């Protein structure tokens, strides 16, 4: 206001900020998947450090054993936590039922939308846009003109990555074959390994793994192949969610230390967890809203890493065309 004549002083010794307690509930696996779950957890840990908290004293994670465990994990979380993140589209129905039971608590669904629930915020990422950039990169480096995509679970979410990836590859060279295989799980490394083994055997020189912890198998297969060959015949992996450059270190057959990560799509799940936790604690929880992260706000990106200069220029050009609306990336 212009003036505030009726005012009273509050001494700093009497003032306090009321904190919140935040928990993530996993859709499958732990907080060491080197991707989705880990990004969320490092976010929550960073938030905890900023607020002088520690694990099980202000923040924690509940690992889900199956779909049947979602409801039980959310109900357990409601004992001590007043901000609860369902990390993954699979938690949709369970988060919806939990928010209706506990109208005094705040819930966040990561990667999916719940409508008409005042205590639920939804967060989506334009993974089609980051996928497109990964496709431009893949198309500018493949020598076999054959690339692979290993999906976790067939879904709207993984279809965004897949549609974006195909469109990006075709934007550079439509001749390039994309082999698509799904593991049917985000926590099945053994299946990631067999799919990657077959994709590489069928002549892919690059595999984009978009399957969470299932992707550990794709890294395992590419490492084994690359260790038993010369450096100049290595096959590539594209990283997902986190910059996975450090996961691609190996020694070739001819004793050269190298790296088989070409590029990584980024999905700033951690940053969203920290930002929404800060908003919940300040009493500004965005209940009932859908928060869309895209290339524009750097909620998704491509880490260029080991890409050729001509690759980086095609990526910069594709990014500019996505931001200005010149290129519309398909979501399916």
Ligand X SMILES: Nc1ccn([C@@H]2O[C@H](CO)[C@@H](O)[C@H]2O)c(=O)n1
Residues belonging to the chain: 332
For residues 293, 103, 74 and 128, what is the CA-based torsion angle, rounded to 10 degrees?
A: -20
Among 203, 158, 153, CA closest to 179 = 203
Closest contact distance (angstroms) between CB of 237 and ligand X is 13
Q: How far is the CB of 4 from Ni ion (least distance, A)?
A: 6
Give the nearest residue (CB) to ligand X: 212
Determine the Cα–Cα distance for residues 106 and 121; give it in Å rounded to an integer. 8
Q: Which residues bind Ni ion (CB under 5 A)?
A: 1
Q: Choose the one of ligand X, Ni ion, none that binds residue 241, judging by a C-beta under 5 to 8 angstroms depending on kind.
A: ligand X
Q: Which is nearer to ligand X, 88 or 248 (CB)?
A: 88
Q: Which of Ni ion, ligand X, none has residue 1 at its interface (CB below 5 to 8 Å by kind)?
A: Ni ion
97 in a known ligand binding site: no
Select the binding partner of residue 157 from ligand X, Ni ion, none (C-beta < 5 to 8 A, by kind): ligand X
- Binding residues for ligand X (CB under 6 A): 27-29, 35-37, 88-89, 111, 152, 157, 186, 210, 212, 240-241, 267
Q: Residue of minimal CB distance from Ni ion?
A: 1
Q: What is the nearest approach in angstroms of ligand X to the Cβ of residue 99?
A: 19
| Cβ-based nearer residue to ligand X, 111 or 205 | 111
* Residue 176 DSSP symbol: S
Binding-site partner at residue 28 among ligand X, Ni ion, none, CB < 5 to 8 Å by type: ligand X
Write down the least CB distance from residue 14 to Ni ion, Å: 16
The first and second tokens of residue 171, run together, are 């934007």
Residue 186, annotated as binding a ligand: yes
| Maximum distance among all Cα pairs of the chain, rounded to whole angstroms | 80
| 133, 318 Cβ separation under 8 angstroms | yes
Tell me which DSSP letter residue 57 carries.
Answer: B
Residue nearer to Ni ion on the CB measure, 4 or 115: 4
User: What are the helix (H) ranges across 140-237?
Assistant: 156-172, 189-201, 215-227
Q: How far is CA 261 from CA 134, 203, 240, 271, 277, in A?
A: 12, 18, 10, 23, 32
**Cβ 96 to ligand X shortest distance, Å:** 17
> If 0-12 CB within 10 Å is exposed, 13-18 middle and 19+ buried, where does residue 22 land?
buried
Annotated binding site for adenosine: 27-28, 37, 111, 186, 212, 241, 267
Annotated binding site: 27-29, 37, 111, 186, 212, 241, 267
């Amino acid at each position: 206001g212009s003036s505030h004549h009726h005012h009273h002083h509050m001494s700093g010794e009497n003032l306090y900020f009321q904190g919140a307690s935040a928990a993530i509930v996993t859709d499958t696996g732990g907080v060491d998947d080197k991707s989705f779950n880990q990004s969320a957890w490092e976010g929550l840990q960073a938030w905890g450090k900023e607020h002088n908290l520690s694990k099980d004293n202000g923040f924690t994670y509940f690992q889900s054993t199956s779909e049947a465990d979602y409801a039980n994990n959310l109900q357990q979380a409601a004992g001590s936590y007043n901000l609860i993140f369902g990390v993954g589209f699979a938690l949709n129905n369970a988060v919806k039922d939990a928010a209706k039971e506990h109208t005094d608590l705040n819930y966040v669904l990561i990667d999916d939308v719940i409508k008409d629930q005042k205590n639920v915020a939804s967060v989506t990422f334009a993974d089609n846009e980051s996928g497109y950039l990964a496709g431009v990169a893949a198309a500018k480096t493949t020598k076999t003109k054959q690339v692979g995509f290993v999906g976790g679970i067939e879904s709207e979410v993984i279809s965004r990555f897949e549609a974006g990836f195909k469109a990006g590859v075709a934007s550079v060279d439509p001749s390039i074959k994309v082999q698509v295989d799904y593991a049917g799980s985000f926590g099945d490394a053994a299946k990631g390994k067999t799919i990657a083994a077959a994709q590489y055997a069928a002549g892919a020189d690059i595999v984009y793994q978009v399957a969470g912890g299932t992707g550990a198998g794709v890294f395992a297969e590419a490492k084994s192949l690359n260790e038993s060959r010369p450096e100049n015949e290595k096959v590539w992996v594209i990283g997902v969610d986190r910059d996975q450059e450090a996961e691609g270190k190996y020694t070739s057959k001819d004793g050269k230390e190298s790296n088989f990560v070409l590029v990584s799509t980024l999905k700033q799940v951690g940053t969203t967890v920290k930002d929404i936790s800060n908003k919940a604690e300040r009493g500004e929880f965005p209940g009932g809203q859908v928060i869309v992260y895209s290339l524009k706000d750097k909620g998704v990106d491509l880490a260029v890493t080991n890409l050729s200069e001509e690759g980086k220029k095609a990526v910069e050009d594709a990014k500019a065309k996505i931001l200005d609306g010149s290129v519309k990336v398909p979501e399916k």
